[PDB]
Enzyme design. Structure first.
Site, PDB file in Angstrom:
ATOM      1  N   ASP A   1       3.468  -7.469  -0.902  1.00  0.00           N
ATOM      2  CA  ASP A   1       2.252  -7.612  -0.111  1.00  0.00           C
ATOM      3  C   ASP A   1       1.208  -8.198  -1.048  1.00  0.00           C
ATOM      4  OD1 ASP A   1       1.198  -6.681   2.730  1.00  0.00           O
ATOM      5  OD2 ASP A   1      -0.413  -6.159   1.339  1.00  0.00           O
TER       6      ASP A   1
ATOM      7  N   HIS B   1      -4.277   0.695   8.756  1.00  0.00           N
ATOM      8  CA  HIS B   1      -3.835   0.645  10.137  1.00  0.00           C
ATOM      9  C   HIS B   1      -2.953   1.853  10.449  1.00  0.00           C
ATOM     10  CE1 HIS B   1      -4.074  -3.929   9.290  1.00  0.00           C
ATOM     11  NE2 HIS B   1      -5.246  -3.502   9.724  1.00  0.00           N
TER      12      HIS B   1
ATOM     13  N   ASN C   1       4.977 -12.277   7.764  1.00  0.00           N
ATOM     14  CA  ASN C   1       3.691 -12.358   8.453  1.00  0.00           C
ATOM     15  C   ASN C   1       3.764 -13.292   9.653  1.00  0.00           C
ATOM     16  OD1 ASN C   1       0.836 -13.606   8.951  1.00  0.00           O
ATOM     17  ND2 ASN C   1       0.472 -11.677   7.862  1.00  0.00           N
TER      18      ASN C   1
ATOM     19  N   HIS D   1       0.845  -1.180   0.000  1.00  0.00           N
ATOM     20  CA  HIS D   1       0.000   0.000   0.000  1.00  0.00           C
ATOM     21  C   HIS D   1       0.887   1.239   0.000  1.00  0.00           C
ATOM     22  CE1 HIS D   1       0.334  -0.615   4.521  1.00  0.00           C
ATOM     23  NE2 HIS D   1       0.277  -1.862   4.092  1.00  0.00           N
TER      24      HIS D   1
ATOM     25  N   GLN E   1      10.250  -6.231   8.142  1.00  0.00           N
ATOM     26  CA  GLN E   1      10.576  -6.287   6.720  1.00  0.00           C
ATOM     27  C   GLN E   1      11.969  -5.732   6.445  1.00  0.00           C
ATOM     28  OE1 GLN E   1       8.945  -7.388   3.881  1.00  0.00           O
ATOM     29  NE2 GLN E   1       6.723  -7.218   4.165  1.00  0.00           N
TER      30      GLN E   1
ATOM     31  N   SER F   1       1.663   0.087  -5.680  1.00  0.00           N
ATOM     32  CA  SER F   1       0.670  -0.296  -4.688  1.00  0.00           C
ATOM     33  C   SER F   1       0.111  -1.685  -4.966  1.00  0.00           C
ATOM     34  CB  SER F   1      -0.470   0.720  -4.646  1.00  0.00           C
ATOM     35  OG  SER F   1      -1.360   0.440  -3.581  1.00  0.00           O
TER      36      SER F   1
ATOM     37  N   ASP G   1      -0.426  -6.581  13.710  1.00  0.00           N
ATOM     38  CA  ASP G   1      -1.045  -5.976  12.531  1.00  0.00           C
ATOM     39  C   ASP G   1      -2.425  -6.569  12.272  1.00  0.00           C
ATOM     40  OD1 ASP G   1      -1.686  -6.606   9.529  1.00  0.00           O
ATOM     41  OD2 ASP G   1      -0.603  -4.703   9.457  1.00  0.00           O
ATOM     42  N   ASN G   2      -2.508  -7.893  12.163  1.00  0.00           N
ATOM     43  CA  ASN G   2      -3.783  -8.538  11.892  1.00  0.00           C
ATOM     44  C   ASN G   2      -4.832  -8.148  12.930  1.00  0.00           C
ATOM     45  OD1 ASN G   2      -1.635  -9.664  10.511  1.00  0.00           O
ATOM     46  ND2 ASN G   2      -2.543 -11.716  10.427  1.00  0.00           N
TER      47      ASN G   2
ATOM     48  N   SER H   1       5.369  -3.956  11.685  1.00  0.00           N
ATOM     49  CA  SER H   1       5.346  -4.739  10.457  1.00  0.00           C
ATOM     50  C   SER H   1       6.580  -4.463   9.606  1.00  0.00           C
ATOM     51  CB  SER H   1       4.071  -4.431   9.669  1.00  0.00           C
ATOM     52  OG  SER H   1       3.844  -5.392   8.652  1.00  0.00           O
TER      53      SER H   1
ATOM     54  N   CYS I   1      -6.449  -3.961  12.625  1.00  0.00           N
ATOM     55  CA  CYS I   1      -7.805  -3.945  12.089  1.00  0.00           C
ATOM     56  C   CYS I   1      -8.834  -3.552  13.140  1.00  0.00           C
ATOM     57  CB  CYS I   1      -8.160  -5.304  11.493  1.00  0.00           C
ATOM     58  SG  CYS I   1      -7.193  -5.743  10.038  1.00  0.00           S
TER      59      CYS I   1
ATOM     60  N   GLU J   1       4.446 -10.238   3.054  1.00  0.00           N
ATOM     61  CA  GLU J   1       3.737  -9.723   4.211  1.00  0.00           C
ATOM     62  C   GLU J   1       2.407 -10.424   4.450  1.00  0.00           C
ATOM     63  OE1 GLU J   1       3.465  -5.316   4.356  1.00  0.00           O
ATOM     64  OE2 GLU J   1       4.505  -5.573   6.268  1.00  0.00           O
TER      65      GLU J   1
ATOM     66  N   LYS K   1       4.249  -9.163  13.805  1.00  0.00           N
ATOM     67  CA  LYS K   1       3.375  -8.839  12.688  1.00  0.00           C
ATOM     68  C   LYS K   1       1.982  -9.419  12.911  1.00  0.00           C
ATOM     69  CE  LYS K   1       1.728  -8.293   8.471  1.00  0.00           C
ATOM     70  NZ  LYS K   1       2.299  -9.343   7.583  1.00  0.00           N
TER      71      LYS K   1
ATOM     72  N   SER L   1      -5.667   1.434  -2.326  1.00  0.00           N
ATOM     73  CA  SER L   1      -4.814   1.429  -1.143  1.00  0.00           C
ATOM     74  C   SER L   1      -3.972   2.695  -1.045  1.00  0.00           C
ATOM     75  CB  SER L   1      -3.902   0.202  -1.169  1.00  0.00           C
ATOM     76  OG  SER L   1      -3.786  -0.415   0.101  1.00  0.00           O
TER      77      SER L   1
ATOM     78  N   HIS M   1      -7.789  -9.820   2.047  1.00  0.00           N
ATOM     79  CA  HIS M   1      -7.192  -9.606   0.740  1.00  0.00           C
ATOM     80  C   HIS M   1      -8.000 -10.313  -0.343  1.00  0.00           C
ATOM     81  CE1 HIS M   1      -3.428  -7.432  -0.121  1.00  0.00           C
ATOM     82  NE2 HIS M   1      -3.268  -7.417   1.189  1.00  0.00           N
TER      83      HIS M   1
HETATM   84  N1  LIG Z   1      -6.758  -5.297   5.825  1.00  0.00           N
HETATM   85  C1  LIG Z   1      -5.495  -5.657   6.446  1.00  0.00           C
HETATM   86  O1  LIG Z   1      -4.700  -4.817   6.694  1.00  0.00           O
HETATM   87  C2  LIG Z   1      -5.196  -7.120   6.770  1.00  0.00           C
HETATM   88  C3  LIG Z   1      -4.394  -7.477   7.892  1.00  0.00           C
HETATM   89  C4  LIG Z   1      -4.140  -8.849   8.159  1.00  0.00           C
HETATM   90  C5  LIG Z   1      -4.668  -9.828   7.337  1.00  0.00           C
HETATM   91  N2  LIG Z   1      -5.465  -9.481   6.223  1.00  0.00           N
HETATM   92  C6  LIG Z   1      -6.030 -10.437   5.339  1.00  0.00           C
HETATM   93  O2  LIG Z   1      -7.295 -10.992   5.881  1.00  0.00           O
HETATM   94  C7  LIG Z   1      -7.319 -12.427   5.562  1.00  0.00           C
HETATM   95  C8  LIG Z   1      -7.365 -13.222   6.809  1.00  0.00           C
HETATM   96  O3  LIG Z   1      -6.226 -12.864   7.531  1.00  0.00           O
HETATM   97  P1  LIG Z   1      -5.924 -13.649   8.938  1.00  0.00           P
HETATM   98  O4  LIG Z   1      -4.731 -13.129   9.599  1.00  0.00           O
HETATM   99  O5  LIG Z   1      -6.960 -13.369   9.927  1.00  0.00           O
HETATM  100  O6  LIG Z   1      -5.828 -15.263   8.639  1.00  0.00           O
HETATM  101  P2  LIG Z   1      -6.539 -16.371   9.624  1.00  0.00           P
HETATM  102  O7  LIG Z   1      -6.286 -17.729   9.155  1.00  0.00           O
HETATM  103  O8  LIG Z   1      -5.905 -16.390  10.940  1.00  0.00           O
HETATM  104  O9  LIG Z   1      -8.157 -16.067   9.745  1.00  0.00           O
HETATM  105  C9  LIG Z   1      -9.032 -16.629   8.801  1.00  0.00           C
HETATM  106  C10 LIG Z   1     -10.027 -17.486   9.499  1.00  0.00           C
HETATM  107  O10 LIG Z   1     -11.314 -17.490   8.725  1.00  0.00           O
HETATM  108  C11 LIG Z   1     -11.821 -18.941   8.787  1.00  0.00           C
HETATM  109  N3  LIG Z   1     -12.540 -19.281   7.611  1.00  0.00           N
HETATM  110  C12 LIG Z   1     -11.975 -19.775   6.563  1.00  0.00           C
HETATM  111  N4  LIG Z   1     -13.001 -20.000   5.568  1.00  0.00           N
HETATM  112  C13 LIG Z   1     -14.231 -19.501   6.361  1.00  0.00           C
HETATM  113  C14 LIG Z   1     -15.588 -19.365   6.164  1.00  0.00           C
HETATM  114  N5  LIG Z   1     -16.186 -19.758   4.901  1.00  0.00           N
HETATM  115  N6  LIG Z   1     -16.337 -18.869   7.139  1.00  0.00           N
HETATM  116  C15 LIG Z   1     -15.728 -18.525   8.272  1.00  0.00           C
HETATM  117  N7  LIG Z   1     -14.438 -18.608   8.576  1.00  0.00           N
HETATM  118  C16 LIG Z   1     -13.751 -19.108   7.568  1.00  0.00           C
HETATM  119  C17 LIG Z   1     -10.613 -19.759   9.039  1.00  0.00           C
HETATM  120  O11 LIG Z   1     -11.045 -20.824   9.915  1.00  0.00           O
HETATM  121  C18 LIG Z   1      -9.581 -18.909   9.633  1.00  0.00           C
HETATM  122  O12 LIG Z   1      -9.383 -19.213  11.036  1.00  0.00           O
HETATM  123  C19 LIG Z   1      -6.038 -12.742   4.870  1.00  0.00           C
HETATM  124  O13 LIG Z   1      -6.347 -12.860   3.486  1.00  0.00           O
HETATM  125  C20 LIG Z   1      -5.134 -11.603   5.072  1.00  0.00           C
HETATM  126  O14 LIG Z   1      -4.354 -11.349   3.896  1.00  0.00           O
HETATM  127  C21 LIG Z   1      -5.720  -8.112   5.953  1.00  0.00           C
END
Ligand SMILES: NC(=O)c1ccc[n+]([C@@H]2O[C@H](COP(=O)([O-])OP(=O)(O)OC[C@H]3O[C@@H](n4cnc5c(N)ncnc54)[C@H](O)[C@@H]3O)[C@@H](O)[C@H]2O)c1
Ligand SMILES: NC(=O)c1ccc[n+]([C@@H]2O[C@H](COP(=O)([O-])OP(=O)(O)OC[C@H]3O[C@@H](n4cnc5c(N)ncnc54)[C@H](O)[C@@H]3O)[C@@H](O)[C@H]2O)c1
Ligand SMILES: NC(=O)c1ccc[n+]([C@@H]2O[C@H](COP(=O)([O-])OP(=O)(O)OC[C@H]3O[C@@H](n4cnc5c(N)ncnc54)[C@H](O)[C@@H]3O)[C@@H](O)[C@H]2O)c1
Ligand SMILES: NC(=O)c1ccc[n+]([C@@H]2O[C@H](COP(=O)([O-])OP(=O)(O)OC[C@H]3O[C@@H](n4cnc5c(N)ncnc54)[C@H](O)[C@@H]3O)[C@@H](O)[C@H]2O)c1
Ligand SMILES: Nc1ncnc2c1ncn2[C@@H]1O[C@H](CO)[C@@H](O)[C@H]1O
Ligand SMILES: Nc1ncnc2c1ncn2[C@@H]1O[C@H](CO)[C@@H](O)[C@H]1O
Ligand SMILES: Nc1ncnc2c1ncn2[C@@H]1O[C@H](CO)[C@@H](O)[C@H]1O
Lengths: 430, 433, 432, 431
Positions: A129, A351, A179, A52, A363, A75, A188-189, A359, A193, A154, A184, A80, A299
């Site tokens: 990313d 964030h 990640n 981003h 990196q 980006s 971050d996650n 994060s 959020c 990431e 991280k 983003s 994502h």
């Molecule tokens: N916007 C941001 O800045 C940001 C930050 C971190 C992660 N993300 C993205 O968000 C997504 C998830 O990230 P994460 O860290 O939480 O991974 P994660 O594995 O820890 O969380 C995903 C969870 O959703 C569940 N799941 C899977 N299919 C499902 C369904 N149909 N219904 C319900 N739950 C389901 C899984 O059991 C899993 O535990 C990733 O794609 C990641 O790239 C975005």
């Protein structure tokens, strides 16, 4: 050709000034600069980057250059980029090709420009990313895998790709996964959020969370922070989950866990966090109440089916950018945010800078570790060591006024752990 | 005939966007919509010319159009120079309502806007007053006491304002019947509380994008707004320190995990500062000089009395405008101070104010009080009044359906045991909720 | 002058324990499904399982569940104040050998463990279920010959597993071992949510003190300290946190907790909670500075985190308010209230974690015993964790009691996420 | 008053005294009352009868009133609320105490009847009450004493509803101070205290996990707000019931689902009644309740649950522990009733912690002085304490908690139209 493309370069003034505010919010990137500044370890490394194009990314880019590296950037998402940070970076002659409101065509072209370097040499390192860049260099002509050293990733989506890229011939380059670092993923996650999501809804909607039924799909690290946010503003949050462990977690934290079929009828606010396809579908959307808001914080925009809705709504009205209101053939209305893409980035600024220092500090390290220790890093996944994970965290404590206890010599012997670290076993989940 | 602007707004082109955002807001404001269905066919406000000086917002547009649907001529201004949403103002102006409001207003302009709302299009002066903060009320009293003989009512919305109102009646300087909408439980305990819970971090974040978690925050005051402000920062991971001059509110805060210390102590520790007292001189030079680098200073109490902005501007090496309503002072120490909205209400100044749903509760009391003062004036007196609890309970009832609440009906056995009506009123008047 | 068979305090309490056991069964869905599943096939047949776990109402369902899986079970508590006397009598009345009572002595404590080692068939134990490593230690140190026939041990607590890893880095581990604590279904549930409720319960039953308004220090922001701090914060306390790990310290700051040293917290704090598993958290320096009638309690396994011996050595007076609640009058004249002689305050001053969270930990334990008895082979001498396939089954077994309706991945979605529709759903490096 | 005192086990007095000593350190307001009013002995000549749970907290109140010149006699207002060690400590001290845990309704009434006439044969001049039971005894029976009684103080929302109702009916015979509706009682004791005392009693009785469970709170007043926050913070999902729209909107803005008992009785496994109203949990609801539901009441009286039907229509009743009953229904499902429907914090635990009770009992002592000293400031009718006194109650507890209060400048204070020593709020301020 274009030295840079950033919408309006007149925003550079504003951006440099958000940069300097971010530097005060990003002490880990600043501590990298004092610690690694003198030695400039990233020298003669030319790094293309796809993240981003936020002000916080500007601090990372600029920490990289102060650490002696040539940097190109683009980006990872269409909405983003913050256009102030784009111009400011490009006013320093660091080639950046990115702007808010990109087209899928404009998005991938910018990456083509970053593979090139102004000197001309292909590249040595890659910071990504998602997988778009990583995949392009692979799937779109691999002539420059040999010259470069390794890559840094990431997102947990893109990390999943890289783990599975190593099931066979993919990964012609050694890779570290930033990640799976605790500094991280467990910050971050979750913590990020928690701040970013509600921000984005408000700016787009200005909707009241208090007393509204909310549905969070996924109770992982992102889902746990998103639900905490809405629970803390008076929201009642129903959680959907496919993993038994995460389900018990949400239930033991006071959240009803059930299916979208059930939750699409009751809740008015919807946020998808699974990283999986088809979380919100046709049946769900037609059941949602009138003027329900539907957003996605994961994502890729495949969690909601915007295609069906665009197609089966009677009317699509654009309230403002990234806010679309659909009038269903039923007469109920559906407000969609960021066309189902990354809402924190599309309807807000992502964030905060502080959590991004955790994060991007990881990196910075990942990038140093691959180029100065290419002997240590065979091609594959790698994961940073723990004393390095702990070091990222230790660099933000002074800002937070945290006085950390030091173990007594007798105490450390009792715990089998060095006074300086590392303090936890590898399997430690924190 | 020196002709008079039918309206004064930033950009009339924004009328289409405002209508759209208004429509979304209407559906999240059932009380105003319910007021339109019950009383609208009977035109209770016929003959009444209401002049309104409230932050010109999308929510306030639903209040304006509701009064208009109830048979009232309406003219409007904002009670803050930064509070007005330009898209809502254009839309209301596009409805033939004289409105004189825009973000970025000068203090001279602000006063001009209010004076344009005193006389309606036919030359007849205002009958009615709807005010937030007291400025319009004081203006009629101070400069235009000629108008008060034919003004049948006054309604006020905020805590600082109801205080001026009360001591106006105490000093004999109040000449119109008045109603205190702020101390209707449905506003006091929902708007000042639940709204600021959400509106404060919106203002902070939009201006600064700053992470609340891991950060020391100070909330001056633990009233309704302070209770909402501290809960939000602590729910975002913030460590909140509160200041309080009432022992009861300090005990409330202590029993809820908050340290209560003086502002002299907090200026050392805290990086974020929110003022909510309705009192002057909460943040002083000594306080700001102690603050850490890039400390964010904001004020959510009505008026810029709580922080010494006049000192800051005059005693800083340098001042830089990052963006509108966000200025960063480079102090003599080398430290930096991030000020939001120039010491003016940060929620409406750096964001869009409280949410529409909670504003429906406040504005529903407002419509109702206007019906009371217009339709039942001989009942009321020059003093300061509060709506009956049977009306306060009605406000709440109108909003339960949108949230999905299922209230239980008391049996005749239960009702007689408790000594109440199955329809209310259900609580004693000293009940604090 | 002969082996007692069972030694408990008041066999009269059997009926009370048995009625409380019936309630706990209905709160422990995993263990009951273990009886229904594994009962008919009797996989623990031949196993002589010696267990050293707190003799609680919850542990009685564990003992009786192991017996229904074919096992011969003998038991002792791992702490002298943890035993619940109604539970111990009930189990003894069924005839299972149990040597446990509240109010034990260190010398009586060792006697109890030694009585569990040889079973009524005259044979030494072939399996170990430990909580703390004490039974494991004794068997290695005092009785090493018994190790040839011990096909495996299972350990429930963070401190015992640290002993196990250090044993195996050295050449000291005699048998194969499973680490139940670091199953996700234990650490992230038992230590977190369990201590959230049990820590407050212990202080309350012991002191009846108010949490609203008080300054509280919790040393440690691990899984125990995360939940302990969450509890106190929920009742109106402000919790100061001490930490040696930078990652936990950052985590605590992001949850709105002040992170500082015990040196400083000893001055401001009135309630003290130790959760580190490391010696000397509260010292003479710290106890002298405490406010009058400050309450000091330890939720770590072992009584080394506070210097009770110094408090005993250097104080003017000790009064006993009630059992396990002692008030010291210092030379300063200030008062220090010590709960359960520094031992686990939840178990000592109350009843410990509630039954439902103990079903998740004890269902891992039942699974580990089966693994070691039945699949010795894939389990060489060392420290092993259960597989995620079974970690998830522990949680799956508890979802219906809580009304959770889980979602089934479409085959399309599962192929997108690269997972079986039945799991494992996450990579093993997942920290949940 | 022939027995002089009746307590379960006087042999437990030494333990009670040790526990009252720790309570005194947690009750600065009562201690400050002894410091301030000690020498003056302002309640000298006062024969006070009390009807409050005989607790360690009530005992610090008893001995504080005694430090102030009063002679007092005490009875409990609930049959299970008395803490026997505390009754023994006060009984040994000479103050006549007539209370034991697990009384019978008949014994309960006889206990209060001993407190009326003091050992010298004289009737009481002051009433202190929790629930109105003693108040109504003196009015309905023995009404000749009402003219030699200078006033009464009441602690309880139930007590004051009755007290306000008595004044309408013309039956109130004494000036009555409504201690409950002082802010330092209602917003602290009913709220913060029930947050800690409800979970305590359920835990000591049941040891059940709050996390993951569905729970229902009937009522969202001061008690139900704190009761609901308590369970939500331990991981429970709380459903709220409400007959008042205002409290219901409040509960909704806090994330709680508000619905009928008819729906919640089907989903939730934990039930706590907080309304003060009859017929909250009925046979209809009980039959729909999940197996082994735990049902409790935190209202002053045992009318919110229908125990008579549970006893009459259940297959089996099994007593696990004192004040814990497991009913096996004809369905086969089980229901666990706590303390036979009476107050569960006082019945299955030890009630509110001492620090919050200092706030409540400091209001009580001030009210008793005002009625005994400033008797003319008060006409028969239900009154409340002045805001300057309320603010003081709070101020006397800030030091213990470490609170550093801001002192207003004269410019600030004149600007706010307030004195620098208060009162700082309009009387209609709801805090
Ligand atoms: N916007 C941001 O800045 C940001 C930050 C971190 C992660 N993300 C993205 O968000 C997504 C998830 O990230 P994460 O860290 O939480 O991974 P994660 O594995 O820890 O969380 C995903 C969870 O959703 C569940 N799941 C899977 N299919 C499902 C369904 N149909 N219904 C319900 N739950 C389901 C899984 O059991 C899993 O535990 C990733 O794609 C990641 O790239 C975005
Ligand atoms: N921007 C908004 O959205 C919004 C909404 C509602 C109210 N307000 C305004 O916010 C202000 C206060 O709101 P309120 O409802 O909570 O009033 P309040 O009376 O309920 O709370 C003010 C508290 O601040 C305390 N105080 C007063 N002077 C103090 C000082 N020097 N230090 C510390 N505490 C001090 C008082 O004890 C008081 O309890 C008013 O000006 C009101 O008009 C703004
Ligand atoms: N009461 C119970 O029921 C119960 C339940 C589970 C575990 N335990 C026991 O409690 C202890 C901790 O359990 P855990 O799961 O949280 O382990 P943990 O590793 O997750 O937590 C320990 C934390 O304490 C910190 N620490 C270590 N030495 C410190 C010091 N001198 N000052 C501050 N922090 C220090 C560490 O940084 C670490 O983060 C162990 O002894 C464990 O066996 C008790
Ligand atoms: N156990 C204790 O220590 C303790 C402490 C304080 C108060 N109390 C007692 O608890 C009871 C309530 O106390 P309070 O201060 O909260 O009074 P309250 O008036 O403030 O709360 C009662 C609430 O229940 C609602 N209600 C009334 N009838 C109802 C019904 N059929 N269903 C649902 N809600 C109904 C009312 O709307 C009201 O909001 C009283 O009996 C009081 O004496 C006990
Ligand atoms: N969005 C909004 N529109 C109009 N008035 C608002 C809004 N948010 C808050 N207010 C009011 O502004 C006042 C503060 O000056 C408060 O009385 C509050 O109710
Ligand atoms: N109620 C309980 N019954 C039995 N064991 C318990 C209980 N509560 C906690 N424990 C166990 O005791 C261990 C402490 O050594 C914890 O890790 C946990 O496994
Ligand atoms: N532990 C306690 N000791 C004495 N009175 C109490 C206790 N807990 C609650 N109360 C009082 O009991 C009343 C309820 O009948 C409440 O008004 C409250 O003040």
């Amino acid at each position: 050709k274009p030295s840079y493309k950033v919408a309006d370069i007149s925003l550079a003034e504003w951006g440099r000034k958000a940069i300097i505010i971010a530097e005060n919010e990003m002490p880990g990137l600043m501590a990298c600069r004092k610690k690694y500044g003198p030695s400039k370890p990233l020298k003669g490394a030319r790094i293309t980057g796809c993240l981003h194009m936020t002000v916080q990314t500007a601090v990372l880019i600029e920490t990289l250059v102060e650490l002696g590296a040539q940097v190109q950037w683009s980006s990872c998402n269409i909405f983003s980029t913050q256009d102030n940070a784009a111009a400011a970076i490009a006013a320093t002659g660091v080639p950046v090709y990115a702007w808010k409101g990109e087209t899928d065509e404009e998005y991938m072209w910018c990456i083509e420009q970053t593979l090139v370097f102004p000197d001309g040499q292909p590249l040595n390192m890659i910071l990504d990313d998602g997988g778009d860049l990583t995949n392009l260099v692979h799937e779109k002509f691999p002539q420059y895998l040999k010259n470069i050293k390794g890559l840094s990733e990431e997102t947990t989506t893109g990390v999943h790709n890289l783990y599975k890229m190593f099931k066979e011939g993919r990964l012609g380059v050694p890779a570290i996964n930033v990640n799976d670092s605790v500094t991280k993923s467990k910050f971050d996650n979750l913590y990020g959020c928690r701040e970013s999501l509600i921000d984005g809804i408000k700016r787009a909607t200005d909707v009241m969370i208090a007393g509204k039924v909310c549905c969070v799909a996924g109770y992982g690290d992102v889902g746990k922070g998103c639900a905490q946010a809405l629970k803390g503003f008076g929201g009642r949050v129903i959680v959907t989950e496919v993993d038994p462990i995460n389900a018990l977690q949400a239930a033991m934290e006071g959240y009803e866990v059930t299916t979208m079929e059930e939750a699409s009828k009751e809740a008015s606010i919807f946020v998808t966090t699974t990283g999986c396809r088809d979380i919100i579908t046709s049946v769900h959307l037609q059941q949602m109440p009138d003027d329900a808001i539907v957003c996605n914080i994961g994502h890729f925009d495949i969690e909601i089916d915007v295609d069906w809705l665009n197609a089966n709504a009677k009317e699509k009205v654009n309230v403002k950018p990234q806010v679309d209101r659909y009038t269903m053939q039923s007469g109920k209305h559906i407000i969609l945010l960021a066309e189902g893409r990354l809402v924190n980035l599309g309807c807000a600024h992502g964030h905060p800078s502080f959590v991004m220092s955790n994060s991007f500090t990881n990196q910075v390290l990942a990038q140093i570790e691959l180029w100065t220790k290419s002997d240590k890093y065979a091609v594959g996944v790698h994961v940073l060591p723990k004393i390095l994970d702990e070091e990222v965290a230790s660099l933000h404590l002074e800002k937070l006024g945290v006085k950390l206890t030091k173990l007594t010599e007798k105490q450390a012997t009792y715990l089998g752990v060095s006074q300086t670290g590392p303090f936890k076993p590898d399997h430690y989940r924190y």
